[PDB]
Design a protein around this ligand. Structure first.
Ligand code: CPL
Ligand code: PLM
Ligand code: PLM
Lengths: 1051, 114, 99
């Protein structure tokens, strides 16, 4: 009607003042919060002198204390929790928890006892404990930001963040408890209520937060391309969680918010790839506003109140307090120096000193002091709290925030690594060369010809910010060369996207650890590359116990008596359990009310209906029984779980007619339900316990998910190691000059590669269900990623405009998000599907049927021999299940093969004796296809994509894949881009031999696989299995009945 | 759109053929072929004038793709591209006149007189 | 980014509040002009701030629309149905044609 709020102007003024202060104090080490405090002091003095601005400032000067506790603190707490790195924090759970909790408790108790002893104020223990809890909360954002800028010791930053978060939460909880104890006394209570109160404060919070987080995460995974809905529902969930936890029920709110934020941050994958950026920015700006407002408020309030009643001697006390709060904390670290030395990452004296000097008090202590001062109404309390808190905050901000950089430099942590320095030098050299080339190109233009050339310095040069016995040499230099080669290979794999993140982090960590270690090659595979592959814990035992618990007979016959099949199918339908579950969950309502009435015309209608409630459900259960028993015969009792259904009904009736409604005898006088009923019969609730039967399969899904995550991590690590080792091998082969070093290096590479391959094969054999799901997800991802790259290239080429490309990209990301919700387990495909999927015969059905007609199944026990070296070719073998070890002479190469591999192709195609004896590592089932049968098939099928053609194309690709690596001279083709590029090429038909094959730009490079060739320049004869380089221009075929000449080109 | 989806199908087939030959992702189930599916088309469902007109539209598509490529590089900004493509399609829908006659349609922006 | 976002929000709120309270000028037109001018000169804005601003204003508008619709539903359901006349419905139909 006549509204004119005066709170917007103050928040906007503080907003602008903070913006100016932050912008101005950028290069200077002094934080802008001191400037904010000074500005608040000036504003408070002015408002005291001038009533006009006092009319606007009194709204926040005497602001209600509860808003500080119930709005500002939760916002800062949730903002701190959200920006966390969940994985690194999880990797240091016990250390952070123990350190934070015990240090907080010890510091609070010691500060409290010092406050009672040293200070002359007559304080009891509760107020002293409140004081300690106020001055035991830290927020060192500056220290962790500086450490991240330095780019080293991420563990220190993670530990600092974890300790700060836990300290803030626990300090707030302790302060709340003790403030309620002090300012609002509530008679006396026994230990019975005290234990319940402690349990409600401690445990009931995190459980509620975890439940809400799980519910909202589940609901967040079914929303597609709706950013607004996701953001709005997340905000609503957070606000409702805090409000319900802290108001409707008396549980703690900060802990629930912390747990919810941590859980949501852990499962950020379900969040669409752009929402979390908006959420992070929103929470950051909210925290910034809260900090600015809190600082201005404390400045004004202290400037008035503390300076009304400040004592000269008090200042002296403050000084000692500072020493105390900078000593005890450090002592705590010393008191825990060895305890966490053997647990987790560990600690060192330099890190301990940095941690001790890195504790800066923040806005939490100021808010608590303001609340305490507002609640009190005298001088001995509230004035002293605020004065001491403000003094401590100012002292810490002035001293530590400015001396931390010098302390870091002294301690030898500001140095720059030589590899980083030389990499930066190379990068800036690259940049200068590119800039010079571009400038030389632009000047030669016709339009931008006479432009002024002051851009040469306007664009400037990106200068380096840093500025400023006969064998061990080659041994060490070759070692570091493998380290850089492995690191760049892993980085390239990441940039492609196949290596994920955690696997890359583990690989690079192992690499640099073994590099800094003295004389041992990285990735010895003994233990450092073993835990992730293993992933062993009673997950599998719990899974097996659940499956054996949920067991049933295969099938029940259908008697032709009565209707038979109709009644049987109506009893066995999923609708049956759907309605029984619905009836139970809607029985939770009546069972709740009677209990309510138990713990308690309205009562008349309550007893009229409630009784109607049981007299209908009982009949419904009876109706189920006649269906679940009849058509099942005795089976009624065969299912050991279903026996529970008989009991529920028997108890129901037995305690409804013989225990209730007495008109014949039975209990009569006995003090049973007749005079009871209010109890005993209430057991109706037992009806709820019946759900478990359907609840058991749900836990299997979560166990499968955990095992799936572990298996995926192990597979990614193994793949990455294998790919890095091959690339590193082809690099070292040409880079190194000496021979003995090269042979040793290749030995150490090959041993580890073979061990990892065998371990991965054994693991895949041990867990069949989830391996199939893992392989499927990685393929769908790889395929979708390549499709997205192709779409982007097509849009860039100009054939497609912007909106169609955007639509197709949206479709692709929707498909990826749908993939992300894939089932955790997939049953293994049958041998028929395995035979069908094989590439060189896939597609048409006639050839598939012809092959399936004659392909015998062979079972081989462990430790047998399938194929002997030097034996004539007889056929192939399709590994359906198991592992096989191939040993052969080429350098005596060895290998391991698994499901989906075929080994007969070379011999069956070129009529040559076998060259590799294969033995079996486990029991193995194989598919044997006779050589005569294959000859008949290849003679029968002679279409354009003939069987002969397809087999030779597969063999040619396999043979020619390693050869290109040679021509690769440090070009980094990643072994995958070459495979793709080669897949584009096809095998040409040598219809005529008198012709001469020409070469040109379209066909690039060509490779010969079978036959022989002669140069068209100097009559140079060349055999089949070799490259031809480029020095040839024309290829001359010839008539040779000994071997068929095969040519495979790429265009 | 038909050409784009044909491109997409060819790339998907090539990638599937490449993976099938792997050693690790060798025996994975091949239901991905339909799980990743195919991005189908959403739409679903006198002797001289011939070569004259067909050559005209060929210049139009060539000019349009050249302007789009210049945009994707970034040298052409946005408003210039919009004006160029607008003039192109206007003169294309117009009957028998080559685009950008430079008389008035490409004159006001160059002039900029006030 | 934080400074830019916060100063933009403060500028908008202060503009409307000062225009509509301290002096008696219209507020909606000033906000319209300010928004149009800022949108025209979005080049000075860092290439990621405007996305956040657009999302923020979109979510605010969505919340306002939902709240307004629920409020009008409740208020009409009570008040209009206390004193609704049978003939009035007829009038409404003609009104539709008119508009
Ligand atoms: C992991 C999180 C961090 C670690 C856990 C956090 C905090 C520690 C845990 C639990 C706090 C409760 C026990 C701490 C010591 C207080 C002892 C005590 O006595 O408490 C009781 C709590 O009983 C209650 O009245 C409950 C009533 C409040 C609930 C409202 C309903 C304080 O009330 P009082 O009657 O004694 O008043 C004192 C007056 N006299 C001295 C005459 C007895
Ligand atoms: C940090 C979160 C946002 C803070 C600013 C939003 C408004 C809450 C605090 C300002 C006072 C208005 C609400 C309390 C009631 C009052 O002060 O009369
Ligand atoms: C669409 C902008 C946000 C709307 C919700 C924020 C709070 C404003 C409206 C809710 C009522 C509270 C403020 C008015 C005072 C009152 O209703 O007592």
């Amino acid at each position: 009607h006549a509204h004119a709020p005066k709170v917007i102007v103050f928040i906007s003024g503080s907003c602008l003042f903070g913006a100016i202060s932050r912008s101005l104090f950028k290069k200077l080490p002094i934080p802008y919060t001191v400037v904010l405090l000074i500005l608040g002091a000036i504003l408070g003095v002015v408002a005291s002198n001038v009533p006009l601005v006092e009319e606007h400032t009194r709204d926040v000067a005497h602001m209600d204390p509860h808003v500080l506790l119930q709005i500002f603190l939760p916002v800062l707490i949730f903002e701190s929790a959200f920006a966390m790195d969940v994985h690194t924090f999880m990797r240091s759970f016990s250390q952070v928890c123990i350190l934070a909790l015990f240090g907080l408790v010890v510091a609070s108790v010691l500060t409290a006892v010092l406050a009672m002893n040293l200070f002359n104020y007559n304080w009891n223990f509760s107020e002293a404990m409140m004081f300690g809890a106020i001055m035991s909360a830290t927020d060192p954002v500056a220290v962790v930001a500086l450490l991240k800028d330095l780019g080293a010791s991420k563990q220190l930053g993670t530990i600092i963040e974890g300790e700060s978060l836990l300290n803030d939460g626990c300090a707030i909880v302790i302060f709340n408890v003790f403030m309620k104890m002090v300012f609002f006394p509530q008679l006396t209570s026994t230990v019975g209520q005290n234990v319940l109160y402690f349990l409600q404060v401690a445990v009931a919070g995190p459980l509620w937060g975890y439940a809400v987080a799980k519910v909202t995460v589940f609901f967040l995974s079914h929303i597609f391309n709706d950013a607004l809905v996701e953001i709005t529902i997340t905000l609503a969930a957070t606000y409702l969680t805090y409000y319900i936890g802290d108001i409707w029920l008396e549980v703690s709110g900060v802990l629930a918010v912390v747990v919810l934020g941590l859980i949501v941050n852990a499962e950020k994958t379900s969040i669409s790839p752009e929402v979390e950026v908006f959420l992070h920015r929103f929470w950051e700006m909210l925290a910034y506003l809260a900090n600015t407002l809190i600082f201005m408020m404390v400045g004004v309030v202290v400037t008035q109140k503390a300076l009304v009643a400040v004592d000269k001697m008090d200042w002296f006390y403050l000084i000692i307090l500072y020493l105390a709060i900078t000593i005890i904390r450090g002592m705590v670290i010393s008191l825990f120096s060895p305890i966490l030395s053997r647990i987790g990452y560990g600690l060192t004296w330099r890190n301990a000193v940095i941690m001790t000097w890195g504790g800066l008090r923040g806005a939490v202590g100021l808010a608590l002091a303001l609340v305490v001062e507002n609640l009190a109404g005298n001088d001995v309390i509230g004035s002293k709290f605020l004065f001491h808190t403000a003094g401590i905050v100012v002292l810490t901000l002035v001293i530590n925030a400015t001396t931390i950089q010098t302390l870091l430099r002294i301690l030898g942590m500001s140095d720059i690594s030589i590899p980083k320095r030389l990499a930066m030098a190379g990068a800036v050299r690259r940049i200068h060369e590119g800039q010079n080339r571009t400038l030389n190109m632009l000047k030669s233009d016709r339009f931008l010809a006479d432009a002024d050339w002051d851009i040469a310095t306007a664009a400037c040069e990106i200068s380096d910010p840093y500025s400023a016995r006969e064998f061990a040499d080659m041994m060490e230099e070759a070692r570091l060369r493998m380290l850089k080669a492995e690191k760049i290979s892993y980085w390239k794999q990441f940039e492609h996207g196949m290596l994920a993140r955690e696997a890359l982090r583990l690989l690079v960590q192992h690499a640099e650890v073994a590099a800094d270690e003295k004389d041992q090659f990285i990735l010895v595979d003994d233990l450092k590359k073993s835990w992730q592959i293993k992933g062993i814990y009673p997950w599998l035992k719990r899974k097996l116990e659940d499956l054996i618990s949920e067991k049933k007979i295969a099938a029940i016959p259908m008697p032709k008596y009565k209707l038979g099949k109709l009644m049987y199918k109506i009893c066995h339908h999923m609708a049956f359990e759907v309605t029984i579950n619905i009836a139970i969950v809607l029985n939770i309502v009546p069972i709740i009310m009677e209990f309510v009435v138990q713990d308690k015309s309205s009562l008349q209608k309550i007893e009229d209906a409630l009784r109607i409630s049981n007299y209908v459900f009982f009949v419904i259960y009876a109706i189920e029984a006649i269906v679940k028993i009849l058509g099942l015969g005795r089976h009624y009792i065969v299912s050991h779980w279903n026996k529970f259904d008989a009991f529920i009904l028997v108890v129901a009736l037995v305690d409804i007619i013989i225990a209730e409604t007495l008109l014949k005898g039975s209990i009569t006088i006995n003090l049973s339900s007749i005079k009871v009923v209010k109890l005993f019969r209430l057991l109706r609730g037992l009806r709820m316990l019946r759900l478990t039967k359907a609840l058991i399969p749900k836990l299997i899904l979560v166990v499968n998910g955990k095992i799936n995550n572990q298996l995926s991590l192990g597979y990614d690590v193994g793949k990455g190691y294998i790919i890095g080792e091959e690339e590193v091998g082809k690099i070292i082969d040409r880079m190194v000059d000496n021979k003995k070093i090269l042979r040793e290096l290749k030995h150490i590479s090959e041993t580890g590669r073979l061990q990892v391959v065998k371990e991965l094969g054994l693991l895949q054999r041990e867990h069949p269900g989830i391996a199939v799901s893992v392989k499927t997800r990685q393929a769908i991802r790889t395929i979708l990623n390549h499709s997205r790259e192709t779409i982007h290239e097509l849009q860039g080429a100009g054939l497609l405009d912007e909106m169609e490309a955007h639509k197709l990209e949206l479709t692709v990301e929707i498909k990826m998000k749908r993939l992300m919700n894939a089932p955790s387990s997939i049953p293994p495909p049958p041998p028929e599907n395995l035979l069908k999927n094989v590439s060189w015969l896939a597609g048409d059905m006639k050839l598939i049927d012809f092959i399936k007609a004659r392909a015998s199944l062979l079972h081989f026990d462990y430790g047998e021999v399938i194929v002997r070296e030097g034996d004539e070719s007889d056929g192939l073998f399709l590994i359906v299940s198991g592992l096989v070890k191939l040993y052969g002479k080429s350098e005596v190469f060895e290998d391991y093969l698994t499901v989906g591999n075929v080994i007969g192709e070379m011999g069956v195609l070129t009529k040559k004796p076998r060259n590799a004896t294969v033995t079996c590592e486990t029991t193995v089932q194989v598919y044997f296809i006779t050589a005569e049968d294959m000859n008949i098939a290849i003679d029968t099928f002679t279409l354009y994509p003939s069987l002969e053609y397809r087999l030779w194309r597969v063999v040619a690709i396999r043979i020619a894949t390693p050869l290109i690596m040679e021509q690769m001279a440090f070009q980094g083709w990643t072994q995958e881009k070459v495979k793709l590029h080669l897949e584009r090429g096809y095998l040409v038909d040598l219809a005529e031999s008198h012709f001469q094959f020409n070469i040109d730009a379209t066909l690039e490079d060509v490779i010969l696989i079978n036959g022989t060739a002669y140069n068209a320049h100097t009559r140079e004869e060349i055999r089949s299995p070799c490259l031809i380089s480029r020095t040839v221009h024309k290829l001359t075929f010839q008539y040779t009945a000994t071997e068929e000449p095969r040519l495979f080109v790429v265009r």
